[PDB]
RNA sequence: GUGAGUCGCGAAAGACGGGUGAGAAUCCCGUCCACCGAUUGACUAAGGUUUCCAGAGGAAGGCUCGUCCGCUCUGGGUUAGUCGGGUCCUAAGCUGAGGCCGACAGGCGUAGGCGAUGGAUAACAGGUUGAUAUUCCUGUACCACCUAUAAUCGUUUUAAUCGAUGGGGGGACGCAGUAGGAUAGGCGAAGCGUGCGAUUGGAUUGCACGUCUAAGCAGUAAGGCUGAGUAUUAGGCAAAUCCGGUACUCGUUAAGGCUGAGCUGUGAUGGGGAGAAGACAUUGAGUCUUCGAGUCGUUGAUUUCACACUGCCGAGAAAAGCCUCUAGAUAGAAAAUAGGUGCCCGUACCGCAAACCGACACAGGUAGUCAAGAUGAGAAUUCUAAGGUGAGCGAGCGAACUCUCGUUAAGGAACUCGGCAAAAUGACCCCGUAACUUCGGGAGAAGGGGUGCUCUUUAGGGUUAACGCCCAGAAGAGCCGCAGUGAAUAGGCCCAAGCGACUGUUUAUCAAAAACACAGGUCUCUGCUAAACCGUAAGGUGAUGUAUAGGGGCUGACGCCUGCCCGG
RNA sequence: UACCCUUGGUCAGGUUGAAGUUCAGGUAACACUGAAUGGAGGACCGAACCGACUUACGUUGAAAAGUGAGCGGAUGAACUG
């Protein structure tokens, strides 16, 4: 087998990273929930 | 200025061997080019060429009160000499 | 011509391919070339719209002057070359002025033969000139429908149109496909059939030789399951139940007309024979 | 809690001695033994994030114990003008001023811009720590740049001279195949160091070593120039001494004109390296100041060094650096000399694994580089170097039963749903080889034979001045054993039939097939922002396409054939 | 995981020996003949690599789909970073 999640940075500091989120409407809303809810981390 | 460019000295067995060829080891404030250290340490002691080499370190972990936390960042800079020498000990 | 390949194994038996006797060099002119990524039949978006393309081999864009725009100036022909993206083999052309431009090859062209682009360039093979001046009863390639665009007509392998006659404005022409159209009097064209004639006797021979091009497979409809295609489903094999054999997207194939009768050139269209 | 002190304790060869310690099958030390060795070895990328090293500790973790660890506690470790990357370029793709579109959101897209797995790019050898090395020092080198200094310029023209943001050249690319020139390492020797055996015997007799960079001067094995030179110019948006064209003198002369290039010689190197006890007051006399002393010749030879050459066709990124041309800048440089200036990131460790993904210290996967010796065609196989490991429970007994391996006389598929499995065949050479056939094959058909060591005689071929060094045949004559490709790795075959023509793919984790596709055939659509299509629309595919072209349906090589019915 | 794009990398060793070329043969000239050359194939054996055919094992497993013994393809419609 090779299981899912053969990991990497660039595809993870891309897509789920910030500047994608804060370069898109929906993502800005997402961040609004992860702030309103309180969290020690974003983009992860 | 010299003040916020030199934060600490460093001493150890490593530096002790280092002082054979007239080397030294300081820790700087971060976000400092290599060159400012040269002209500034020059400014403060009048010692010079034997240019600098330098590194960084990533911050480790530590548990002192069973709560997680990290050490502080550390940029270490290694100074070496050709012109007299300096002792401040 | 086409040289049969002696059968040595299963995947050569019916094989056949060209001889390449109308070629003088192999490596092209760097300059006129131009690069070309591929798409595999799909959009600006990324979705598949046309089916079964892609998989193939890499290639480039050899530029052509279909306009034959610069007129009067005699030219010569110092080389032939090969062109993957079209059936029709292709010629290089040293103009009088040192320029260099590639042109689709008419059958029966001689290296060192000279070919013109002008009004007063009297008739031969290759020469470029309008339709009004040409006589009737002649075969012509690479007509433009419109002044100054770059021709769209008879541009593929083999023979080409026939001029049946002309008014002053507009001008008739019969195609291969045998179908008729009124064309402007002033559209630029040329004379002589196109080059390669036996591009179609090629028995491609083996599955890969569609992939080498490339194209890729197409699966039937009476095999799939009934979502993906209407004919599909059915225990065992599948007679087409419904009348009017359908596309995957409804919309039959078999006899249905799809010319949209509001188009402006429908007056120019007379005597529709092939479609 | 019960189950249960029961199943399990996660493939594997360890043993002994001496220490330690409160206490040892498990810790350290050594000696022996065994294992891998196209690897359980060595080097880096992704990845993880301090696991790295020293000193202590053993509460829990470790599938046992544990005086130990990749666990805890304290302390400490990662050095670059030249290395991978950025201040250089670019495709796919992403974003995209103005702009076109959409109920809002937002969607499309030009200009430009970001984005490497690719292109260009200035460095090497040794030493060194418990832990870093092309980063430190030691020596020797290189690129850009500034400052200082002069041997050439002379309207700032043109000339020395800068030069594009524009014009040009090249950079610049496929796949397969054979042959060749070089070196890597290996090989066996008549040069060097040590040492002569206590088991019968032997003494040219045993063992190990046999190097040296990048850089700069010369040359250089093989290739290349549809060629060199002149004049002109209907063109390369403006210009052009450059390109491209066109006409001529010289051309096939190869004179070798020019180009690029393996690698070699020399210095670098009266130096580093080094088999070296023949070296001490000394360190555990191990050890270190210390002196020891060699670079020869042969044969073998790549899968490394030119997509170079030839052939084929399925017709094989881009841009920049780099070199030129002018428009233009501008008084008027700098040869070779000295001196200095040279940024950010990363660098520790594991990296076929105990540290990554896999919930575990898990018998899985995990791209890439190097990859020695005998045997062999070979990266196959068997045994070993280099080096690394002894697999984190073991001691007893040697019952059932299960599993894994080996054997079994007589018979030989009777078992059986079915010769499932197991066994037999198996390498090299030689003889020979039917039906049928789309003439290619079938065909390794089948069947059958030989193969060991010694001695003698002989063919030979490559390599050399020759010596000898290699390579692999024949003939005879002999010896042994049951057995001579003595072990290991390596095809079971024949006949007949249906289905399918192929080779290929498929139901990831119960089906790999007679299914799907396939080249071919056929019908219908489609006259070009063509039809079909995704979308609301712009827009874009189709398509750098233009009816010998593109889309849809059905059938499935071949060749013999493809009947009647148009009422529904 | 499935396709597709751009860009790279990989595939020991051996066997077979077409087209074409050329030497003679041979014709009025071509067909055609026999040699030598040349090295095509979704060609043949067969390790890497890939895959999963049969069987045994395991089946509160070593593993939430593998191992061992054998097996098919391996210059192409191949594989994969
Ligand atoms: Mg003991
Ligand atoms: Mg090119
Ligand atoms: Mg070539
Ligand atoms: Mg890292
Ligand atoms: Mg493992
Ligand atoms: Mg070997
Ligand atoms: Mg019998
Ligand atoms: Mg029987
Ligand atoms: Mg078809
Ligand atoms: Mg094979
Ligand atoms: O094979
Ligand atoms: O094979
Ligand atoms: O094979
Ligand atoms: O093969």
Swiss-Prot record, chain A:
Q: Where is this region: Disordered?
A: 1-44
Which pairs of positions does the record mark as disulfide bonds? none
Instruction: Give the matching Gene3D superfamilies.
Output: 1.10.287.3980
Supply the alphabetized keyword list.
Ribonucleoprotein, Ribosomal protein
| Family annotation (HAMAP family) | Ribosomal_bL34
Q: Which family does it belong to?
A: Belongs to the bacterial ribosomal protein bL34 family.
Which NCBIfam families does the record associate with it? rpmH_bact
What's the protein called, per UniProt?
Large ribosomal subunit protein bL34
What organism is listed for this UniProt entry? Staphylococcus aureus (strain NCTC 8325 / PS 47)
From the broadest rank down, the organism's phylogenetic lineage runs:
Bacteria, Bacillati, Bacillota, Bacilli, Bacillales
Curated annotation (Swiss-Prot), chain B:
What Gene Ontology terms describe where this protein resides (cellular component)?
cytosolic large ribosomal subunit
Keyword Ribonucleoprotein assigned: yes
Q: Pfam families of this UniProt entry? A: Ribosomal_L23
What Gene Ontology terms for biological process does this UniProt record contain?
A: translation
Tell me the keywords, alphabetical order. Answer: Ribonucleoprotein, Ribosomal protein, RNA-binding, rRNA-binding
Molecular function (GO) terms for this protein are: rRNA binding; structural constituent of ribosome
Q: Does the keyword RNA-binding apply?
A: yes
The protein's role, per its UniProt record: One of the early assembly proteins it binds 23S rRNA. One of the proteins that surrounds the polypeptide exit tunnel on the outside of the ribosome. Forms the main docking site for trigger factor binding to the ribosome.
Say which family it is in: Belongs to the universal ribosomal protein uL23 family.
**Quaternary structure?**
Part of the 50S ribosomal subunit. Contacts protein L29, and trigger factor when it is bound to the ribosome.
Protein known as: Large ribosomal subunit protein uL23
What is the source species? Staphylococcus aureus (strain NCTC 8325 / PS 47)
Gene that encodes it? rplW
UniProtKB/Swiss-Prot annotation, chain C:
For this UniProt record, give its keywords in alphabetical order, as a comma-separated list: Ribonucleoprotein, Ribosomal protein, RNA-binding, rRNA-binding
Q: Which GO terms describe its cellular component?
A: large ribosomal subunit
Q: Which residues cross the membrane?
A: none
Example GO biological process: cytoplasmic translation
Which GO terms fall under molecular function for this chain's record?
RNA binding; rRNA binding; structural constituent of ribosome; transferase activity
Which InterPro entries does the record match to this protein? NA-bd_OB-fold, Rib_uL2_dom2, Ribosomal_uL2, Ribosomal_uL2_bac/org-type, Ribosomal_uL2_C, Ribosomal_uL2_CS, Ribosomal_uL2_dom3, Ribosomal_uL2_RNA-bd_dom
Entries under SMART domains matching the protein:
Ribosomal_L2, Ribosomal_L2_C
**Residue numbers spanned by region Disordered:** 35-54, 212-275
Function of the protein: One of the primary rRNA binding proteins. Required for association of the 30S and 50S subunits to form the 70S ribosome, for tRNA binding and peptide bond formation. It has been suggested to have peptidyltransferase activity; this is somewhat controversial. Makes several contacts with the 16S rRNA in the 70S ribosome.
Assembly: Part of the 50S ribosomal subunit. Forms a bridge to the 30S subunit in the 70S ribosome.
Q: Member of which family?
A: Belongs to the universal ribosomal protein uL2 family.
Q: What is this protein called?
A: Large ribosomal subunit protein uL2
Name the source organism: Staphylococcus aureus (strain NCTC 8325 / PS 47)
């Amino acid at each position: 087998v090779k299981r899912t999640y053969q990991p990497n940075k660039r595809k993870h500091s891309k897509v789920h990273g910030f500047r994608k989120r804060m370069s898109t409407k929906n993502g800005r809303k997402v961040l609004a929930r992860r702030r309103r809810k309180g969290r020690k981390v974003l983009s992860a | 200025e010299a003040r916020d460019i030199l934060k600490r000295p460093v001493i150890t067995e490593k530096s002790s061997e280092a002082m054979a060829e007239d080397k030294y080891t300081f820790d700087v404030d971060t976000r400092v080019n290599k060159t400012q250290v040269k002209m500034a340490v020059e400014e403060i002691f009048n010692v010079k060429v034997a240019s600098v080499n330098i590194m960084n370190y990533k911050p480790k972990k530590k548990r002192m009160g069973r709560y997680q936390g990290y050490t502080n960042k550390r940029r270490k800079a290694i100074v070496t000499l050709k012109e007299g020498s300096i002792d401040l000990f | 011509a086409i040289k049969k390949y002696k059968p040595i194994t299963n995947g050569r038996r019916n094989m056949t391919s060209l001889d390449f006797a109308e070629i003088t060099k192999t490596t092209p002119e760097k300059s006129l070339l131009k690069p070309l990524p591929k798409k595999a039949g799909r959009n600006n978006q990324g979705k598949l719209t046309v089916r079964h393309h892609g998989g193939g081999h890499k290639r480039q864009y050899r530029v052509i002057d279909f306009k034959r725009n610069k007129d009067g100036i005699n030219a010569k022909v110092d080389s032939i070359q090969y062109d993957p993206n079209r059936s029709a083999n292709i010629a290089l052309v040293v103009y009088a002025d040192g320029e260099k431009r590639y042109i689709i090859a008419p059958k029966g062209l001689e290296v060192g033969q000279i070919v013109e682009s002008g009004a007063e360039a009297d008739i031969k093979v290759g020469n470029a000139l309008p339709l009004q001046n040409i006589p009737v009863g002649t075969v012509v390639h690479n007509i433009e429908l419109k002044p100054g665009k770059g021709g769209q007509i008879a541009r593929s392998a083999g023979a080409s149109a026939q001029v049946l006659g002309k008014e002053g404005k507009y001008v008739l022409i019969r195609l291969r496909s045998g179908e008729v159209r009124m064309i402007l009097s002033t559209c630029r064209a040329t004379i002589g059939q196109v080059g390669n004639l036996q591009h179609e006797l090629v028995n491609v021979g083996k599955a890969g030789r569609s992939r080498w091009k490339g194209i890729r497979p197409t699966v039937r409809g009476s095999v799939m399951n009934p979502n993906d295609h209407p004919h599909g489903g059915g225990e065992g094999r599948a007679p087409i139940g419904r009348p009017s054999p359908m596309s995957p997207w409804g919309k039959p194939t078999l006899g249905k007309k799809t010319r949209r009768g509001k188009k402006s050139s429908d007056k120019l269209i007379v005597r529709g024979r092939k479609k």
